[PDB]
Amino acid sequence: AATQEEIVAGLAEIVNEIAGIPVEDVKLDKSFTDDLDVDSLSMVEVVVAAEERFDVKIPDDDVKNLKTVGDATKYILDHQA
């Protein structure tokens, strides 16, 4: 497995770049394209990058069900390669 906070931080580092939202405000209650407020199209870049960032394969198809940083982590934490 990986460290949940490291997972969230992995999300954060991409979000800070692509979305333009603080690495640090990438908490765990934070819904990416909602509370943080990314963008719809920039969202898919986070996803695509996450695949390499976390070393996993998270398709945009299912990623739409993650909705938060915490639930993104849930996928990654469980789907760890």
Give the integer Cα–Cα distance in Å for 80 and 36.
25
Residue 35 annotated in active site = no
Distance of CA 79 to the CA centre of its chain: 13
Residue position matching structure tokens 């931080």: 9
Question: Which of the following is catalytic: 25, 35, 37, 39?
Answer: 39
Q: What is the DSSP letter of 80?
A: -
Give the integer Cα–Cα distance in Å for 8 and 38.
15
Catalytic residues: 39
